[PDB]
């Protein structure tokens, strides 16, 4: 038998974490660069996540009402003999364990979308001589390289690079930055003009040739389209792989449509035809793309059935009833496919979208369209 | 803030040692769950000294006063834990649906170390009886 002993003082550093089958597979992988890392945005407020090299789980502690004692085996330093009490079914002692910890909770892991903590990361608009400006402001926070950013972000490396590329992250003059929408698309426009001006293979672009093509006839001190900018535009509007980029053409057209909405039709509800004409005329010559207004669904609204006007999702409320109120103020009757990407952000329950709409407002159908009226 | 889990040592030991055979891992670990509160003395150094020598119910090991609080006898899946002179607990060895893992937060060096991974637990769900 094994004698069970207890110490007068337990180490509270020992804690129990649930290991799912997938976690076990991850755990038994020596290949990984980083195995697992606990991450948090701050010390006192934000949630704590557990990250592997490519996935993120949020941790939740679950208390229980039982006494849970972990015992480790130990070899007694001096031979110790115990008296026999009226105990039945006792084999000879062969090893000894001691309860060294008393745990009251477990750490459950739930899969969640990793996000970057963009607290101290400033916005770059393509200003000349920006190194001076980073000291015109008092940014104590230092981010030399992107790996340091990822290290201090609640996400994995792959998630980090994907989100960083998605939000158009870059680095200028050794300072990490986030490109403004305007200057990023302007750099895209000039790049496409130069790429089609030099008849480059848009499916097999590399950094050097395009960077050389953009900054050929402008001074380097006043040429903000550096090699890092090139890497960002390629990693944002193209897909890499000896890895080369191929353009995401429908995506580029969609971005371009968002840009057109934000610059030209953000204050008036133009008829769709004239907007499509002007929109079409803004592209660099011979760019291969077709268009339909549904490729900007979720970025616009329709005051009447045949007109379009820009709306930014960021300006919408987070209170459900208020946001629905303002949505119905913009449009009394909505098309379903127009309003669906606009409401995705409010509740993650995974229900039928119609049920999601049915908490405040109500649906009403017709021939093919279903509109929503808050009565 | 952020910190890595160090699991290299446990992993290397796991690959180089055989699969877990009994309820105790090769590194010598066991958990235990009791539906209740284990009522223990609030002090130990003073009380470990008055225990007579024949009983050895409160022993001293390397300057730490350990209490001998019970005995465990494992018969297949069935298990029995004797506590004190007046308690007997009947329980079972159950295979964990979710393999638990014990870790260790070294606050000093801000290092986290994987201690071990469980697969079984010894549970006692019935009211304790006398040792007979």
């Amino acid at each position: 038998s094994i004698n069970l002993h207890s110490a007068p003082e337990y180490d509270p550093s020992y804690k129990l974490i649930q290991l799912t089958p997938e976690l076990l597979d991850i755990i038994q992988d020596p290949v990984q660069n980083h195995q697992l890392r606990f991450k948090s945005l701050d010390k006192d407020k934000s949630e704590v996540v557990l990250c592997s090299h490519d996935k993120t789980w949020v941790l939740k502690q679950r208390k229980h009402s039982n006494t849970v004692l972990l015992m480790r085996e130990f070899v007694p330093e001096q031979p110790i003999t115990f008296d026999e009490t009226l105990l039945f079914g006792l084999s000879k002692p062969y090893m000894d364990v001691v309860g060294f910890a008393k745990t009251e909770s477990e750490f459950e892991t739930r899969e969640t979308h990793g996000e970057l903590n963009l607290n101290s990361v400033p916005i770059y608009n393509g200003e000349l001589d920006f190194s001076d400006k980073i000291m015109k402001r008092s940014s104590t926070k230092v981010i030399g390289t992107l790996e340091e950013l990822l290290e201090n972000s609640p996400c994995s490396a792959l998630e980090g690079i994907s989100k960083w590329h998605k939000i158009g992250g870059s680095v200028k003059d050794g300072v990490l930055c986030i490109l403004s929408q305007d200057f990023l698309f302007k750099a895209l426009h000039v790049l496409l003009m130069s790429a089609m001006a030099e008849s480059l293979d848009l499916q097999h672009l590399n950094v050097e040739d395009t960077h050389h093509a953009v900054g050929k006839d402008i001074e380097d001190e006043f040429n903000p389209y550096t090699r890092e900018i090139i890497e960002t535009v390629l990693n944002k509007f193209a897909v890499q792989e000896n890895n080369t980029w191929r353009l995401r053409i429908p995506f580029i057209a969609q971005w371009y449509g968002i840009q057109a909405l934000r610059k030209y039709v953000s204050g008036i509800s133009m008829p769709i035809d004239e907007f499509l004409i002007k929109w079409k005329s803004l592209f660099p010559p011979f760019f291969p793309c077709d268009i339909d207004i549904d490729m900007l669904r979720g970025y616009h609204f329709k005051p009447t059935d045949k007109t379009v006007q820009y709306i930014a999702k960021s300006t919408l409320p987070m209170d459900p009833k208020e946001r629905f109120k303002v949505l119905f103020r913009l449009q009394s009757q909505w098309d379903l496919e127009d309003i669906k990407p606009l409401i995705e952000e409010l509740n993650s329950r995974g229900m039928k979208i119609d049920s999601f709409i049915m908490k405040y407002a109500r649906r009403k159908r017709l021939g093919k369209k279903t509109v929503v009226t808050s009565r | 803030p952020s910190v890595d889990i160090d699991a290299s040592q446990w992993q290397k030991l796991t690959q180089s040692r055989e699969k877990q055979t009994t309820v105790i891992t090769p590194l010598g670990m066991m958990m235990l769950e009791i539906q209740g509160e284990l009522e223990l003395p609030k002090d130990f150094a003073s009380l470990a000294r008055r225990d007579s020598p024949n009983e050895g119910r409160f022993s001293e090991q390397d300057g730490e006063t350990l209490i001998r609080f019970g005995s465990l006898q494992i018969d297949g899946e069935r298990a029995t834990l004797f506590v004190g002179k007046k308690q007997r607990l009947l329980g079972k060895v159950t295979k964990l649906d979710v393999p638990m893992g014990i870790m260790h937060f070294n606050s000093k060096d801000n290092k986290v170390e994987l201690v071990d991974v469980m697969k079984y637990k010894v549970i006692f769900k019935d009211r304790p009886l006398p040792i007979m």
């Binding site: 804690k15 606990f38 948090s40 701050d42 010390k43 006192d44 407020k45 934000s46 949630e47 704590v48 941790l59 939740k60 502690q61 679950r62 208390k63 229980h64 009402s65 039982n66 006494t67 909770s105 750490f107 459950e108 | 803030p1 009791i34 539906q35 209740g36 509160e37 284990l38 009522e39 223990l40 003395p41 009380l47 008055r50 225990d51 009983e55 119910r57 409160f58 209490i67 609080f69 506590v83 004190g84 002179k85 007046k86 308690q87 607990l89 937060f105 606050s107 769900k125 009211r127 304790p128």
Partner: peptide, 26 residues
Amino acid sequence: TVKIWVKYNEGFSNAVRKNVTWNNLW
């Protein structure tokens, strides 16, 4: 010396899941 026992809980209870802060670990 014989004052060690378990105060039996009539039924098993598992508490509410809680969020974890950095201070919760340390």
